[PDB]
Each structure stands twice: as structure tokens, then as C-alpha cells.
Design a protein around this ligand. Structure first.
Ligand SMILES: *[C@@H]1O[C@H](CO)[C@@H](O)[C@H](O)[C@H]1NC(C)=O
Ligand SMILES: *[C@@H]1O[C@H](CO)[C@@H](O)[C@H](O)[C@H]1NC(C)=O
Lengths: 319, 323
């Protein structure tokens, strides 16, 4: 067990389990490391032999690993005198999943991450094929090609009417004010894996048509992932990659509830592409305070929120 | 909520923000104490309930009973001073804290104590108190009356967490550890109390597709409805030694006993103790489909085995079981 001391203005000490937030920390405390870059390289040789253009990362740290290891891998690949050039790209927005998966055991090109292409489909990319051995993190090959995120990375906790589902890239908070409902969400990444129900709190009788964070977007199948007058934000501003969902009004905007408002569609931003600000918003059934997203390009509103009088075409949505 | 914690086994410590769950069970000091909001209102509720025709009430948890014992004379004092002739009497608690079919809402009176015929549990009040706020310091806690009736344990006392493939469901008298060795399963369970409420789903992990026949710790014993409450080859231990009240159950053999897996072994029945009423020690045990290390209960009178586990040779009627 983990024995120590923590302070909230109350002080408490003892033994138990401590769940940390590594998302909001400006410092990068964790890095990913391989146990056998040789085995990895061989698995990539096999993958290319098994017909694979490249691989797509599940998380940000995996991508950073692929980046920091690519030269050595290519070097190793050259050390084995096997003709292949490994190319690692960047991650942006939702990390799309790959249907292929690695198996443990002029020049060609192996495309790790990067943007989409016609030469290499997502179905030819490998994904979710690296798990954690132990803790800098000793990683390794997986059992099989499950569409779940790594269990050793997931975490969760609940006490004093505050529930948290946490990850190395996610930080999801719900609370009990009259009822249990989602409160906050923090994202460094957006991934296409599924949140394991082993590390999930309150998973019984969960309507997937109501869970805000999408299941196929590592959304916890939980009644904590619930918010009255909301549904799954399938078409939300997840194209940001890094964002902060909360339940308040965007700065300088006003949202009201009315039947006169339109139907739910792709999330929109307060700021026009031209820079024009809209202050008047509406929802047909949403529950004030409204679902908002804080990111790079500014604030966005939930799918349920549409502008009152302004035409939707004038705005920017999830493309 | 920021702080620093150190793991000896992991040989690693960490600082930062987040959420800390504390094992209130293996605390050397009884840090917590139950205290009401307005004892006068409690007394009022007692008078009203007695007038309704109630005979007594039953605590839900240990520290609740402690509060009752800590405020009874003051309560009985309030009664007389506020014009009424009711004698409130509180006995101790042993084993399972039987629920009461009735409840509180905002000739003598009996609280807890032994089971009696004058005041059956069907006419007892139970699960009528909830916490509003926490005191600080010893650490005390407020209590007020519930506006709703249920058999759920107070949500504000339960906790849960998962990290490093080790789940924990905690309480003030419960501490239930699960882990991932090969597969996910329950590893330990610590009790200072045995209650009959229900462990709510809001504070539960993996509550999907949970066979109550597979949940080791019974649902009606505040057992977490979870696949963290599972064990390969074991079922709901309804006839475990829950008469002990305080116990520490886990998975290892009893000291100087032998358990094996044999289809010839007897079927599952009441949990037996390794030692008989005379004092003999049953060294040979078995199970049909159970898995080793065996489900054992470390209590006061010694080590016990799971329901699936039977004495290999010795007639089970020569052994002591949960009556
Ligand atoms: C809790 O919800 C009520 C309405 O349901 C609201 O009036 C109150 O402000 C909320 N408490 C908060 C936000 O702390
Ligand atoms: C997991 O189970 C195996 C089965 O024999 C055992 O050898 C091992 O020690 C167990 N691991 C832990 C951490 O208890």
C-alpha cells in the first residue's frame, strides 16, 4: 500500500491509494521506454512483411517514444541490413485507430503516425499493440488486438462525493450536487480506444446515448459521464487534441433555453472565422450552465447549443 | 488536494494533486467519531416514532452505535426535560447488524443489543441517518436525518480506487482489495464491522454483468456488486463466519492445514472452523472446484475456510460452523 500525507483546509495522513493528476502538471513526469528495440524492429520487419504501411499511436507518449526511438530503430534496421526507412509523423486531433496490429516474435517506407494518406489507409496501420510491463515506463508487446486502452495506465477514484476517471492524457471529473453528473474534463490527447470496465466506476445500466465522452473516444461507460439535457458529443471539438471541457458560459456569451432554438448539430465556436463574436445562444433542452470547451482557437459550445439568431453557416464547426 | 505519498514495495514516492483514499480499518487510532446536528431533533424523531408504534432501532455501522452510546444519557435527559416518559436503552453490537424494516423521519426504548421478542427487527428503525459535514482535528462528523428510505449504506462514507492493477473498495469498517494476478480477482477483505445495508453502485467499480451468485461478499452484506468481488471457483459466501463481526479474510491455507481440489469432496455448506469445540485441528481439507490458495477467514477463534471447503475425512458434524 501507499502510506503518506496529503493536504486539501484539512490535513490527513495514513495508508491507502493515491491517485495523481499528471495532466495539469506543466512538467512532463513520465516518458515511455522499450525493453527490446531489436524485438520491436523485428516486429516491424514482420509487419511490413505482413503488409503494413506504418503504425498509429494510441497515446501522445507512445508517439513521443516512436519519435525518440526512430533513429535507433532505423539504425538497428540498418544494423540488420534490412531495406526499410522508418518515418514518424506528428499527432493532431483524435488519434485514429488501426485495424492491423503488431505480432511479437527505392527504399521502402514505414509511416508511423503523421496525417492520413491514400498510399496507406488506417486499416493498414497497426494500433494498440503495445502494453506496459512495469514502471520512465517499461513497455512491451500485447496479448491480442483488443480495442481497449492499456489497463496499467488507467486509474479511477471516488470519495467525499467527487468521482474521477483518470489517465495519462485524460482527467475526467464528476460530482454530487443534487445528483451525480460530469463536471470537468481535461485532454492532452484524444484516442480511439475503449475505456476498460475494470477501471470504470458505476458501469451498470449506462445509456451510451447519454454518455458525453464518446465510447469510441475512450469515454468511460459510466453514469458519471452523464449530464442532464445532454447526449454523446460525437461531433464535438475533439479536433483540437488538447482541450478543457467544463460547464459554464463561454466568456462574453449568453445561452438560454428555448423551443425556438434549432436541433443539435456539430459544435460551434463563439469566435467566427472572421473574428466576429456571437453573444446570443440557445438550446432546446440543454441544462444550464452549458457544456463548453476551452481550447486553442477559443471557446466552443456543446452540440445542443446553437446560435439564437445568427446563421450556423457563418460559424465554424467540427470539420 | 495536493500531497506526497511513498510506496515501500514499489520503492517509489510521488507528489502532486489528485485524490487519496485512506485505509480507516487498519488505523491504530480511532480517528473518526459520529456526532449529530441537533440531538433534540433526534429525540423528537424518537418520540414520534414510538408514538407511531415502534419498539426500537438498529445501528447501521459501528461508529453510529458508538454515537448512540455516547449521547444516550444526554438523549434520555432531553426526553424527561422536554416532557415525556420514555426510557431509552442501548445494548452492544455483535456479529451482523441486522437491518430494521422501519425508519426515522424528521414503556422503554431499545437500541441495538441482543435480538429480542419484545422488539423484533421487523419493528426496528435502521438506515435513517446521513452525514452532512465533517469535523476536523480526532475527526468528528455531522449527522442529520434522511428524507428518503433505502437499504443503501451512506454514500458519503464509501470510497473506491484503482491504480497499478490493484482495486480497493473502502469504508469505515470495510477494506476490500482486488488485483490483477493473471486475471482480476478479489485478494483481501478487512472488517471491523458486518452490516446489512447495500453497497451503492455510484461508488462501485466494474458493476456490469455482476452475478450475485458469484459475488463472494453477499449483496445484503454491503458487498460491492462487482467483478472485483469475484474469485475463480467460488460463490457468494452467505454462510461464511459473518457472526464474528470483526474479521480478516484472504486467500491462503490455515496454519498447519492442507486443502486440495477433489471432485470427491463434499459440496459447499456452512463455513467451518479448523478447530472443533473440543480443540482438535482438522489438517485435511478439500474442495470440488475451488481454487488454491483457499478462501480463509482469520478471526477471533482462529482460522476458517470457505463454504466450498470441507474436511477431507472427518465428519463435518464433528466441526463447528456458523449457526
Ligand atoms: C446544485 O444544483 C442546484 C440546482 O439543481 C443549483 O441551484 C446549485 O447552485 C448547484 N450547486 C452548485 C453549482 O454548487
Ligand atoms: C500470482 O499467482 C501465482 C500462481 O502460482 C503465484 O505464483 C504468484 O506469486 C502470484 N503473484 C502474486 C503477486 O501474488
Amino acid at each position: 500500500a501507499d502510506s503518506g500525507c496529503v493536504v486539501s483546509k484539512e490535513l490527513k495522513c495514513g495508508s491507502g491509494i493515491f491517485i495523481t493528476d499528471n495532466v495539469h502538471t506543466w512538467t512532463e513526469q513520465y516518458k515511455f521506454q522499450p525493453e527490446s528495440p531489436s524485438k520491436l524492429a523485428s516486429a516491424i520487419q514482420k509487419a511490413h512483411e505482413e503488409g503494413i504501411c506504418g503504425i498509429r499511436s494510441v497515446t501522445r507518449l507512445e508517439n513521443l517514444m516512436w519519435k525518440q526511438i526512430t533513429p535507433e530503430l532505423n539504425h538497428i534496421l540498418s544494423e540488420n541490413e534490412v531495406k526499410l526507412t522508418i518515418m514518424t509523423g506528428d499527432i493532431k486531433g483524435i488519434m485514429q485507430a488501426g485495424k492491423r496490429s503488431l505480432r511479437p516474435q527505392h527504399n521502402q517506407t514505414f509511416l508511423i503516425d503523421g496525417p492520413e494518406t491514400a498510399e496507406c489507409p488506417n486499416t493498414n496501420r497497426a494500433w494498440n499493440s503495445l502494453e506496459v510491463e512495469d514502471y520512465n515506463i517499461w513497455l512491451k508487446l500485447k496479448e491480442k488486438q483488443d480495442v481497449f486502452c492499456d489497463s496499467k495506465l488507467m486509474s479511477a477514484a471516488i470519495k467525499d462525493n467527487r468521482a474521477v476517471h483518470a489517465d495519462m492524457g485524460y482527467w475526467i471529473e464528476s460530482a454530487l450536487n443534487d445528483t451525480w453528473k460530469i463536471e470537468k474534463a481535461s485532454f492532452i490527447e484524444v484516442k480511439n480506444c475503449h475505456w476498460p470496465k475494470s477501471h470504470t466506476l458505476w458501469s451498470n445500466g449506462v445509456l451510451e446515448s447519454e454518455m458525453i465522452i464518446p465510447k469510441n473516444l475512450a469515454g468511460p461507460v459510466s453514469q458519471h459521464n452523464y449530464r442532464p439535457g445532454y447526449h454523446t458529443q460525437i461531433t464535438g471539438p475533439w479536433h483540437l487534441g488538447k482541450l478543457e471541457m467544463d460547464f459554464d458560459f463561454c466568456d462574453g456569451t449568453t445561452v438560454v433555453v428555448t423551443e425556438d432554438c434549432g436541433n443539435r448539430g456539430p459544435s460551434l465556436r463563439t469566435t467566427t472565422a472572421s473574428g466576429k463574436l456571437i453573444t446570443e445562444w440557445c438550446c432546446r433542452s440543454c441544462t444550464l450552465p452549458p457544456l463548453r470547451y476551452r481550447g486553442e482557437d477559443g471557446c466552443w459550445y456543446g452540440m445542443e447549443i446553437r446560435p439564437l439568431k445568427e446563421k450556423e453557416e457563418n460559424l465554424v464547426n467540427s470539420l
